[model samples]
Target: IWLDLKDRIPYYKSDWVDAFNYRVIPSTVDTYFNNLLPAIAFAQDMFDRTDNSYGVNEVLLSSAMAGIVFGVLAGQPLCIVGVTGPISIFNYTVYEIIKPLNTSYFGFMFWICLWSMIFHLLLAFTNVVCLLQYVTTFPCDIFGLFINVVYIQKGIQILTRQFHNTSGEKSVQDGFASVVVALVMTAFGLFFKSFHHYPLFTHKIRTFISDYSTALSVLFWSSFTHFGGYLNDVKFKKLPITKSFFPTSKFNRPQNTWLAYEPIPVKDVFIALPFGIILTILFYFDHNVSSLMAQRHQYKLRKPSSFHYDFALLGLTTCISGVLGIPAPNGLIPQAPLHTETLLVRDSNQNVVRCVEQRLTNTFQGLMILGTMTRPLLVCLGEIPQAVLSGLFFIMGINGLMTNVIIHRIVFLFSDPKRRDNNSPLAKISKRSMVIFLCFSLAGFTGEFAITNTIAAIGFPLVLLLSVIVSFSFTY
Candidate 1:
């Protein structure tokens, strides 16, 4: 197990002490510690600032569970969970818009997520995930592009609301000017790449000089100021002494005094169930696409059975996570082959095989058992930056775009009767193909063409109906 890489970069190390003392103390740390915590706080902050004006009440459990569920199903370890600011906001917006029509806030959110999970579970159980086999690289990329663009827009909204205030920003024109200034500054800040070296040239370094955003920003600016003084050959001033090496540690956790099902109310259950189904279907599509990237080539594998079963397990785990209360659903990115390979010496009779999903499930089941039983050991990494989770959002969308492109291109290219010979699998014009294209198109267009508004509110009956129609039209 000990492969020496003394000269190589050390990224993954056993930090069990840190995991226990710091990372696992208050909240169980995840792979994206620096990114997840701050992002979650950002969500809490946004909800507090606008909707509640007091504090956060509801937590989106499925979003966090999606990671573990997807990870177990997709053959990847170290997958983390949580929701993005925009997605969390979108969920809230949907709740507000629809909750009025239906009473029960807790009940409604609960069942919507539940149904979404059930829907995905059934779809995978039936082995119809092959329908998404047509998704390709280009579409995944385009989808990714839209998701990032929306997230970026949300950040812009936050800024505009922040700075377009007070006397100097009296007129709308002033507001416009403020926004433009902020936007340019943000763009300059974002576009600037920083490495370990080249202090002055980096845009991040430049933004630190300006100092607009946060306490971290202030600290960063002061530290850099001293460094700048050092750079300019000015020597007489006192050096800025270190205040503290690490942040003040605070551990907060809920007391699990009660142990019961505490199932969602019956009325709210209907909506939540559907929401769960849709959410799971989305997971199925998004997760499997990522898994495919890893599984198809790396293991040189071909089996939808394990994919369906383990993925279904993931959905089930996500539902459990929701019931148990996690922020977002976790997902598996499906590790590359090199990451999964192993070596074992032959004792008597040698037998070796890899890329089998069932074998992988045995492993997943064990880890899940551990996670399920000992959640108290988990510490929520509250310091993770939104920008880093933002990167994950980018990855998710990109994966979708890639799968969509491949699926679309393959079906369009090979499904043609002319291009595909009669000797080849007979291709025909059918509603099934049309529906597949339509689902992807609706999802894509809803994201891109115009307002991504109320359509997704209607996404349930709409997508559900399409799923039914496609299933009926395409027979085994």
Candidate 2:
């Protein structure tokens, strides 16, 4: 066990100064917001869907603490830890499964996470995670691509919702203004981000513009909507913030307590084992793939990687979040890539020059998460238009898809199915074969994968049921 752990840990020669100057400072503030905003949205969405079964502040605090812990212990600053859709879906499933048994959902969750943590710890200590190297890049790329696809679909759905007409609801006279604002904000965000690659600006200026792009975009559009009198017709959905950082006792949680969970029956703990295993595998895949995605050649980091340590920290955080009854953290997709991209300095050729290796970005982000959990700060975040944030996510999703190696490599399949004069074998292939390839590629983008990824995240029970039925048809 000792040898296995020792063999897989990151062996970078980084010192304290190196870590602090390159990774953990205010220079990375823009990247911090880019990472934090979507996560806060996810947390807010989960809490709402669960009807406050999951506490927003609790999720914020626990994720902040876990992120800080992992930053120090795991030695990977780019890894953004937060609640993901799968975990939420799994939790909702757990609640439904035990609700009929008349058991405490909180109690069952605690046991499930506890056992999952124990299993992760065993793998961490035994260094079984070393096998991750055997996992090919294909599936990892697919998963990352899947996440990018989901982000795009989600952003589109959010934008389209504003245009939806409810039978009994009054239509906004200026709904078109809201759509225009969202489109403009998204365009501005993308334009500012493009400044990083624009030849007009100096490198330092470009970096500055790109780093603060999202924050600036949000601020500018938010002010525009507020002062421009657009709010009269445009609706603003704000986050619910309370006076306390922790949920009130009515949720069965104590005031300001970091750790709290009701005891589960010993028998029920065993009953949770299968569900615990299911969650453990989901957590492992999510974390592993996100970490692997960051380690791709494009980022060009100069550090020894640490899979074992990171996995161990993830498991530890899961246990703590479980006890606190907050949403558990997983390796976030867009956030991690966004973090790495911010620290990167690329040449005109788009080659990596040098990465700003420092701990301040993650450290500051962690601290900000803690502050964001407070009542007033949440209110401040809440005031930001959903459309602005949606625009930011739109840029993120598009950028991710455009830059992805797999997406580019496979896109030719979906290129026009028409013929070419080049005497190449593929060009000479049957029209039926080309048509079949095009259909599959298009389906991959627009069919079941898209529906399941977005709908599951939104916690739509009908989609979940349909997915279950479809999956069973393919199974026994």
Candidate 3:
């Protein structure tokens, strides 16, 4: 409750020492690119949707600055910090609300963040985070599903925009490229990603391919689209990245990056108060659930969880991001789990020895992100087609779902099994229980999904809460 630095000091000291190991080298590389691609996509997505209010530069800078802070100081350094689907959606909603009022978007958002930070620090000190127990696996699974759906939907959703010929500005090749890039990258990436388990290559070679699968697929498809387009008069839409580092909304007055140049009207600040509370709710649920997903019992991480400490830090970062008019990052479902999974060290027998508990990955992850803002790195980072990244998003969604027990169980039941392991507990689940579970799930799932697709998008947590809260109440 006191933020417990006494408990964290030893781990913090070792985090630096342990970071020098060889294992951290590959983990840093994997985490860097794996994180970078999504950073580009989400920033690009926000740029277009929010009319340049927040974009690549903002996302990259915000993510970079805090990852190091969170890495160096957090009780758990392994939680990957970055822009996420929920935060991005909140960004979008805030922009929409303020647009009609003609108020400064990020200016108003700055107050919401500051207010929420105060709220978060109060929650941490009051020890409210300990109640994170009942709000457990039920919402965690559904929340992951929501994140997956956001990723999957946005990929397809963006492709749908490519098909409109209303302005006659786009050609058929754009749609063709979108379809090809979306499916092919996933096919190639996932195929190579599984090579570590295959018998066709040496362990080192297979692991290398597995580790760099996304980078490899991106390179292959990018060159394919570029050269094929050049030589064959084919066309593909490349990812749109701004050439200069500027506040997207204030390109005319990039000095406004501080959000103080044109402050929100004093009344607008008051109006933002309730919205800040909403943001606090959203941030609280997302941070705790994502942390739960990261520190799952399976990973066998030994460091004590400091939810209060993390919450305070998350709020501080949000305040910083708001002041700078950048996207605020929190612990995210996919990246946090993946970061923890990547840090796991396997013994000679291929059993996990332990998680490489340290801060090196997060520390350098921040440094790498900050480096991308430089001209030299942007030249290298900007070549891929948007279609390629969108397709990659599809793979991330599928990859995240693979970790989900619900998705696995559902797919397992539907797949015609080889008929082995007939006596397993999964095989022993009563048909009646599953039928009941499926029906109850569908009722809540359909409710959340349908509303989420409408103006009620943020209601995902509420509907899903009913799915489990009421049903779990009955299951006993």
Strongest candidate by lDDT: 3
Question: What's the lDDT for all of these models?
Answer: 0.37, 0.59, 0.65
TM-score of 3: 0.88
* Positional deviation of residue 303's Cα in model 1 after best superposition, in angstroms: 10
Most accurate candidate by TM-score: 3
The weakest ten consecutive residues by lDDT in model 2 span 459-468
Instruction: Order the candidate numbers by lDDT, best to worst.
Output: 3, 2, 1
How well does candidate 1 match the true structure in TM-score terms? 0.47
Query: What local lDDT score does residue 436 receive in model 3, on the 0 to 100 scale?
Result: 52
Please provide, for model 1 over 1-476, each residue's C-alpha lDDT reduced to its tens digit, 9 standing for 90 to 100. Answer: 01212211131132222123221211221222222322333444444443431112122223323433454343333223334443344455545655575543333444555665566556655656765455422233333334335544555444443334334453442334334333433343333312111234443343332222222332233333334422433321211111111111011323121123346456544545445545665666545544554444423445322455555666666556444433344332311211222111011113334322222222232233322332321221222223323322332222233333324444655466566543233223443564455455445545444545545532432243344345443333
TM-score of each: 0.47, 0.78, 0.88
Off-target runs (Cα >4 Å) in candidate 1 are 1-38, 41-46, 49-74, 78-81, 85-90, 97-104, 113-117, 161-268, 292-306, 330-447, 453-476
